Amino acid sequence: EEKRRQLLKQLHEHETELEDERKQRALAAAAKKKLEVDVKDLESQVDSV
Amino acid sequence: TKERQQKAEAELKELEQKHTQLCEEKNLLQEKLQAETELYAEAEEMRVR
């Protein structure tokens, strides 16, 4: 029962910690896409200029 | 009581099959949605250009 409690606690903690990392991945990907759009916009500006 | 157990386990299995199905369909629709959003962005920015 104690082994169950320990392993379950570890699983829960490691899962929530890496879920926070997954949210950081989502944020990073959003920022990446935003900057990609900015690059395309600026490239269009350079074309016209 | 054993008959009711068997029925409860059958209902449980049915719900489990539908749960994993809906989860996979959700995943596929989310992936496809992200693709269509990217395609829309690519089309619209070039439309503006």
Q: Which residue has the tokens 């269509």?
A: B36
> What gap in Å lies between CA B49 and CA B37, rounded to an integer?
18
For this entry, resolution in Å reads: 6.3
Q: How far away is chain B from the Cα of A44, in angstroms, using its nearest Cα?
A: 7
Question: Which chain B residue's Cα is nearest to A42?
Answer: B49
**Per-state percent for chain A, helix, strand, coil, to nearest 5:** 95, 0, 5
For residue A14 the two structure tokens come to 């490691």
Name chain A contacts of B49, Cβ cutoff 8 Å.
44, 47
For residue A20 the two structure tokens come to 């926070």
User: Nearest to residue B35, comparing CAs of A25, A33, A44, A19?
Assistant: A33
